Design a binder for this molecule. Structure first.
Ligand code: CA
Length: 324
């Protein structure tokens, strides 16, 4: 039904250009929408999604693994057709801990291996909020070890800035396959994207809609933005589709999150149109540095990746939780 094209990673493998997001948010972790996430996942797989993005932190790996096993049992897919990503959180940054975290995640998901595992953030923080001051290079040795053990087919990072990417790429034995970061119409990360792509690291965007979608003095575009609507009518697409297609056209993988099947379907119908120079220039005008995801409680930690706002306690839901 939908046909998602693939980008090539720097290790020989493909990654589908669109992935199904599984993080429900901290609104305090909100479990209420789980059933809808799972039902829209099953639908996503039925219509042709193969890329599933999850994490230890997202709490739902056991349930995602049940859905995957169901779709495999139904004959809808084979394991080999799916691209499944998980992620190691801030308290597992010692080299030997990456194996413990990932094996546990793999048990939850019911798998031999994932297709991709990420360093969720560059900071090393205990469950009690202590800065462990572990270099992400030490952590990366553990990612290289779990690769060699066949626990994953690829290793990557998330939320690394251009300085962290450069130092990682200068020191690693196996380069990261991806850098997963926020990219949207207000936060283009042009220099960081260009740097990654020049080094053959694929960029994967979370919060691809930034603040455009309803979920306060946040910038344009809003969903009722006349220029977005106009670009819409021109190529016969909705506003969200313009947004995703633009990212796609930057060579960026998107991970939208929705629990609504019509949105699932709509998000994947974005590969049959080319934005022309005029509309690319318009969409580029929305870029203004506004960062949708800026966890201020992590500013004081070593390797916090973003620009610090001078003059500001880690909530417990960002440190200690149960899964399933
Ligand atoms: Ca497997």
């Amino acid at each position: 039904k939908v046909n998602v094209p693939n980008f090539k990673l720097n290790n020989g493998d493909e990654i589908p250009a669109l992935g199904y997001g599984t993080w429900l948010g901290v609104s305090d972790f909100d479990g209420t929408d789980i059933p809808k996430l799972l039902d829209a996942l099953s639908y996503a797989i039925d219509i042709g999604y193969r890329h599933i993005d999850t994490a230890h932190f997202y709490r739902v790996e056991p349930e995602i693994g049940q859905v995957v096993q169901e779709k495999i049992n139904e004959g809808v897919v084979r394991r080999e057709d799916l691209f499944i990503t998980t992620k190691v959180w801030q308290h597992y940054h010692r080299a030997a801990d990456v194996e413990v975290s990932l094996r546990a995640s793999l048990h939850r998901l019911g798998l031999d291996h994932v297709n991709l595992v990420l360093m969720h953030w560059p900071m090393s923080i205990s469950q009690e909020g202590v800065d462990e001051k572990i270099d992400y290079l030490e952590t990366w040795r553990g990612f290289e070890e779990v690769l060699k053990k066949g626990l994953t087919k690829a290793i990557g990072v998330s939320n690394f800035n251009i300085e962290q990417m450069k130092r990682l790429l200068t020191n690693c034995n196996v380069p990261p396959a991806v850098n997963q970061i926020e990219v949207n119409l207000n936060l283009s990360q042009a220099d960081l994207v260009d740097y990654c792509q020049a080094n053959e690291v694929v960029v994967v965007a979370y919060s691809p809609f930034g603040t455009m979608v309803p979920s306060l003095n946040s910038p344009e575009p809003k969903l009722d933005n006349p220029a977005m609507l106009a670009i819409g009518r021109k190529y016969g697409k909705t506003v969200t589709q313009v947004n995703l297609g633009y990212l796609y056209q930057r060579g960026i993988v998107s991970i939208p999150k929705t629990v609504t099947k019509s949105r699932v379907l709509e998000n994947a119908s974005i590969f049959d149109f080319q934005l022309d120079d005029e509309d690319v220039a318009t969409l580029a005008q929305f870029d203004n540095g506004f960062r949708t995801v800026r966890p201020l409680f992590w500013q004081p930690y070593e390797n916090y990746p973003f620009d610090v706002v001078p003059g500001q306690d880690i909530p417990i839901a960002m440190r200690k939780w149960k899964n399933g």
